[PDB]
Ligand binder design. Sequence first.
Ligand code: HEM
Ligand code: HEM
Ligand code: HNI
Ligand code: HNI
Lengths: 145, 145, 140, 140
Amino acid sequence: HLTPEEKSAVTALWGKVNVDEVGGEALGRLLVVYPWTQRFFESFGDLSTPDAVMGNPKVKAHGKKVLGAFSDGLAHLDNLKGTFATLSELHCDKLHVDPENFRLLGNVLVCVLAHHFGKEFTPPVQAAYQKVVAGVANALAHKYH
Amino acid sequence: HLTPEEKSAVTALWGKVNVDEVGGEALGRLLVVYPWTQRFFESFGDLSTPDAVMGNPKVKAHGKKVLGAFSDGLAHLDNLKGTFATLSELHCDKLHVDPENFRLLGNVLVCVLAHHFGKEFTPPVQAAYQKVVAGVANALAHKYH
Amino acid sequence: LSPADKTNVKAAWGKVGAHAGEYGAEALERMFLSFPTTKTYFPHFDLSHGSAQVKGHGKKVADALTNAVAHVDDMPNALSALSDLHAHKLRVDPVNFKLLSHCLLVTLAAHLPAEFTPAVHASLDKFLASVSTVLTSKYR
Amino acid sequence: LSPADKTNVKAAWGKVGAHAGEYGAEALERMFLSFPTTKTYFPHFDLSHGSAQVKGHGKKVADALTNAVAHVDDMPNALSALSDLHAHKLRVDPVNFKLLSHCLLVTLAAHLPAEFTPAVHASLDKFLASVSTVLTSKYR
Ligand code: HEM
Ligand code: HEM
Ligand code: HNI
Ligand code: HNI
């Protein structure tokens, strides 16, 4: 659970986020850093070289959809299990994505936020966003329980 | 959970499980196989070598307590939250035990069952005990999740 | 790894013998029943208890494992061919290697009780984890 | 670790330079704030912001990593003295290594944007995983 200051600092930073690129960078970095995750995106095409993964227009378009789902999680922090109920069913029952990969993507997003905000992504701001991405990972893995 | 035939197989197999040396062996092996788990048992004296762990009375007495808790969880499989409602808020914000070790302890108990029952601990029987140990581990990882 | 850990593996896999393919096959069999998701890595397979294929790759895993025991130090070098297939082609999730290693430990505990001591267990688990790490260290 | 990976780690650590102690201290702080579970290994430390002991420990963790980037091939020898402190007596859960690694990446991402490219990020994450493994190789 986020303190009032943590909730304020998170919504504050998020409003400054480029909803068009961050999701793409986060998803792209996941496929380069942990390349076994490329097994769920073979239908996306070019993913061999690192510049191809980032420059891929589908990795960029899909990342935007992933970012949207995190924005939804942020808007409703008290109802994460509910917000990610259809997506938990989708990822767990249809896709068979191991829940460990939700934790990795949340951590890659944290690395992307630090990369875009520099010194504005302070250690308590990161501490707050760690609660968020952990909350989203657990809620997206609820159908496995 | 699982099918009542698997619930019958789990209860029949647990009927043959003593109360015991199984728990002592499970807790003991978790301490041997994953030596980082030894940090939470600093008051237990000597553990330096595998024989010191297995030959520890504090270890075997604690192992009994652990298996005794699994037994109660097996008594109420329909609601794992209400049974481990006194054990989850004991291990997390006080002991500071990573929820990953709960999965390892269950998986080590499964090895101890195979070590005791051999051919009797057949693969579909293992599958039922696996859903069980996953449930217990999930229920014990309730708070800060 | 540890020198004391690379003595227990010899004793355990030395008493395994020629029916290593059964010990390997059983571990596979145990994985699909206990973990559903692991089925996806075999789409053209109909493997129930007694299916002809399950012993084939069960042997392949066991023989790849005997190669790893004889080559404990040059393990990333000796099992270099499999590291490519498990990466570049299949792209197996590192978690699923932990699921098989566990079912493999269960099999050894089941068939070899006087061998599966807490010290041998701790070493076999250290071996299999260091094997998994070799088969996964290729995707980039 | 491909020959291109070690070029990326050294180039990124080349822009780290004198700021290594500073980046190591921040990574540790990020770990203490984001994961209070890791504080349990330091009840004898002043875990306040700007502590000279977190700054000093930051320098020790950073120099150990500067030593690891300098000694590219076959690391278990240089970090053997460190493997007995962490694993043999203080016995730190390996997940905490994944946590410090991530906190180290968050630090480098915030301070070196132009050098924290996907390729470097993967090379550093793999390097920190290999340092983590070398620091978790001997367990009793
Ligand atoms: C907490 C992290 C995650 C969030 C918020 C998330 C969110 C989403 C969303 C919103 C979609 C679109 C669903 C649709 O079009 O109907 C999606 C699709 C998908 N996700 Fe995730 N996802 C996450 C993690 C992952 C991970 C780790 C993987 C595996 C590498 C993954 C694999 C997929 C795949 C393969 C699809 C394709 C479904 C489609 O056609 O859109 N996701 N995800
Ligand atoms: C103990 C660790 C493991 C070892 C030593 C191992 C060993 C092997 C060997 C020797 C082969 C034969 C290669 C060939 O086709 O000529 C093989 C094939 C294979 N392994 Fe592994 N393996 C291990 C773990 C896994 C895991 C965890 C999975 C996935 C759940 C997996 C999936 C496969 C698949 C899919 C094939 C090829 C069969 C096909 O083409 O559908 N392996 N493995
Ligand atoms: C590696 C750490 C660790 C794990 C994985 C673990 C996992 C488990 C699991 C299954 C996953 C179960 C069912 C279980 C059950 C119990 N544990 Ni655990 N315990 C662990 C560390 C402890 C410690 C430490 C205590 C005693 C606390 C203390 O400080 O005296 C403990 C005490 C108990 C007690 C005694 C409760 C009481 O004080 O009356 C039970 C019962 N448990 N523990
Ligand atoms: C969460 C626990 C933890 C982690 C993940 C961790 C991860 C790491 C990593 C991983 C990349 C590196 C390179 C590293 C390097 C070092 N650690 Ni770690 N250490 C940890 C807890 C410590 C503690 C505790 C000490 C000793 C503190 C002290 O008082 O000297 C330590 C001490 C050190 C020292 C100094 C020892 C000395 O005085 O000679 C170095 C160097 N380290 N540690």
